[PDB]
Design an enzyme around this catalytic site. Structure first.
Site, PDB file in Angstrom:
ATOM      1  N   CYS A  99     -34.125-103.548 -86.235  1.00 49.65           N
ATOM      2  CA  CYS A  99     -33.383-104.523 -86.007  1.00 49.65           C
ATOM      3  C   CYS A  99     -32.725-104.966 -84.695  1.00 49.65           C
ATOM      4  O   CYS A  99     -31.710-104.276 -84.749  1.00 49.65           O
ATOM      5  CB  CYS A  99     -32.914-105.141 -87.711  1.00 49.65           C
ATOM      6  SG  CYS A  99     -33.871-105.089 -88.755  1.00 49.65           S
ATOM      7  N   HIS A 117     -27.685-109.921 -91.495  1.00 51.16           N
ATOM      8  CA  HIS A 117     -27.563-109.650 -92.296  1.00 51.16           C
ATOM      9  C   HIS A 117     -27.228-108.368 -92.371  1.00 51.16           C
ATOM     10  O   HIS A 117     -27.537-106.733 -92.790  1.00 51.16           O
ATOM     11  CB  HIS A 117     -30.136-108.685 -92.664  1.00 51.16           C
ATOM     12  CG  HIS A 117     -30.002-108.469 -91.512  1.00 51.16           C
ATOM     13  ND1 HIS A 117     -30.234-107.212 -91.805  1.00 51.16           N
ATOM     14  CD2 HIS A 117     -31.195-108.809 -91.192  1.00 51.16           C
ATOM     15  CE1 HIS A 117     -31.043-106.456 -90.830  1.00 51.16           C
ATOM     16  NE2 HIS A 117     -31.838-107.704 -90.200  1.00 51.16           N
ATOM     17  N   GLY A 152     -34.592 -99.288 -88.582  1.00 47.96           N
ATOM     18  CA  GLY A 152     -33.226 -98.769 -86.846  1.00 47.96           C
ATOM     19  C   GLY A 152     -33.802 -99.788 -86.508  1.00 47.96           C
ATOM     20  O   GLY A 152     -33.373 -99.841 -85.239  1.00 47.96           O
TER      21      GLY A 152
END
Ligand SMILES: CO[C@@]1(C(=O)Nc2cncc3ccc(NS(C)(=O)=O)cc23)CCOc2ccc(Cl)cc21
Ligand SMILES: CO[C@@]1(C(=O)Nc2cncc3ccc(NS(C)(=O)=O)cc23)CCOc2ccc(Cl)cc21
Ligand SMILES: [Cl-]
Ligand SMILES: [Cl-]
EC number: 3.4.19.12
Lengths: 300, 299
Positions: free
Chosen positions: B139, B41, B137
């Site tokens: 991820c 993503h 942030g």
């Protein structure tokens, strides 16, 4: 979202852990630059522990009596000195993995990460707090002596604790990195006991502000309290007195949530009276006191 | 003595954390050898094959500390993006990619902008979510276990669900749970308690000197599972009983003898008492975690 008991990443400290051996005693040491720091009781036998004369035991030792092992490499000891309850072993190699660091002495209520080690090898990392009675509720087996406590701010490691002993109640006692014990403890196997422990009030309030930040307000009420009335009630539950310094420190959390410190104090008074009634706060059925105001701001 | 929620030492993983930026999106990547692994993503009803074909190697900015790594190739494997870089990570530890089962525990190194901020221990819930602590942030932060000198990577963070819990994939990009990497109505399923872990934690309490919950009674596996089903506890299997064998021999409390203690705790509560400083029954320590912490295994 979420709130966990979080430790600092331990890598910078792992690169400093060494094994120190003197006779039949083996424990952990902290290798920073060309010095290895470890508990002075590494020079004691079990018999020596009742009334050891460390100055008399130390004068009988030479540099080559101390075996220091860093990974699979033997370090050569070229000097030794005692500073309070810490032994400082000068070695011929500076630690190439030495991080940016400071030695800091902390106050009760302050939190830190512990890297538990055995034979100079790290086994785990956990978060804990310096209790009001100057002990720590750690997880330490025999051989963990010399394991260290620390905080990391920016790229700097602040070493605040070195493990020395387990008290009869299962709690732990140690020194700062200058070898000064926290609490009225001695590195002697004499009758010593932890004083009556209390709950860290400023930390419980910080954790209640963390619950509000994460969306939980069930415990709030329409009341306020004076600081003195709060302290008279809280002392009845073995809670530490809340000072004006604590109220000042909670200022930022009060401004972010819109709830006055003394209003959060009134909520705590009611929680102490009523309990949780089958409910939890941040996944806990007990009031948590091992997160400081600084930890809540850092994590939330 | 003492029993803490303990994480593995994170050093070997800290040396692999990098920052990955694509357009306005910045997240964390895991740099092993000459490949950086991160959630797909980072390129974002998305069509990842269509969004990826429009990207060139120089569109991905990879930062390792204060050094820029140059991306020389890219490919997708399930929900993970694999960025080939020109430099192999000199700090690459001995490692494996492993897929874990619900009930298994692991350490998480939470990172922001390729910089590690904290380490905590957690378990893969029966509903395939993790109760983590993650902000925007985070991820690409990873979950792992260490055995001997080998890091087994088992989790990569992808998203937060509306109840505050977290969802992610193994390092091959396969999600844990019925989740998808899209902004769509997704929710955590009804969770259950990990029974074998609660029993392991009761054995840890006995080892540390807490015995108030022990009783003279025993039970059968079938009767205990009828009770476990009533209190939203996972079924206890013969494999679980076998796995608890060592702890049963050390303490002298047979697994169905400890099950009888757990049944009484579920039916009557704790009555103002605590176990290892907790008023709730803890299920995020496996039998192996209890043995490891009560024996001092090192890495
Ligand atoms: C030399 O270390 C002592 C010590 O407290 N060690 C320990 C530290 N951590 C965890 C422990 C867990 C279990 C354990 N068991 S036992 C049978 O006592 O060896 C000892 C531990 C041993 C006991 O007497 C003393 C007295 C003073 C000092 Cl400053 C140290 C010690
Ligand atoms: C792109 O990241 C998403 C996401 O769940 N991120 C997060 C991961 N961890 C923790 C978080 C904490 C707070 C937060 N707040 S926010 C930015 O307002 O959504 C987002 C988090 C947010 C948008 O919806 C999606 C949809 C699918 C996927 Cl696989 C990811 C995400
Ligand atoms: Cl302090
Ligand atoms: Cl209960």
């Amino acid at each position: 979202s979420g709130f966990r008991k979080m430790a600092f990443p331990s890598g910078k400290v792992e690169g400093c852990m060494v094994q120190v051996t003197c006779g039949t005693t083996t424990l952990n040491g902290l290798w920073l630059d060309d010095v290895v720091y470890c508990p002075r009781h590494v020079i004691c036998t079990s018999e020596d522990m009742l009334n050891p004369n460390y100055e008399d035991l130390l004068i009988r030792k030479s540099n080559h009596n101390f075996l220091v092992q860093a990974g699979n490499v033997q370090l050569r000891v070229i000097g030794h000195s005692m500073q309070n309850c810490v032994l400082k072993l000068k070695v011929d190699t500076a630690n190439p993995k030495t991080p940016k660091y400071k030695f800091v002495r902390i106050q009760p209520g302050q939190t830190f990460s512990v890297l538990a080690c055995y034979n100079g090898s790290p086994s785990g990392v956990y978060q804990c707090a310096m209790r009001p009675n100057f002990t720590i509720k750690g997880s330490f087996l025999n051989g963990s002596c010399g394991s260290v406590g620390f905080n990391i701010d920016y790229d700097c490691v602040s070493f605040c604790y070195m493990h020395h002993m387990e008290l009869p109640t299962g709690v732990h006692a140690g020194t700062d990195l200058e070898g000064n014990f926290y609490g009225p403890f001695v590195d002697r196997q004499t009758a010593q006991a932890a004083g009556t422990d209390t709950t860290i009030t400023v930390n419980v309030l910080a954790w209640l502000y963390a619950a509000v930040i994460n969306g939980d307000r069930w415990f709030l009420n329409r009341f306020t309290t004076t600081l003195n009335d709060f302290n008279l009630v809280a002392m009845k539950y073995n809670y530490e007195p809340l000072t004006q310094d604590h109220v000042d420190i909670l200022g930022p959390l009060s401004a972010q949530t819109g709830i006055a410190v003394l209003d959060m104090c009134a909520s705590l008074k009611e929680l102490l009276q009523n309990g949780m009634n089958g409910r939890t706060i941040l996944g806990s059925a007990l009031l948590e006191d091992e997160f400081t105001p600084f930890d809540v701001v850092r994590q939330c």
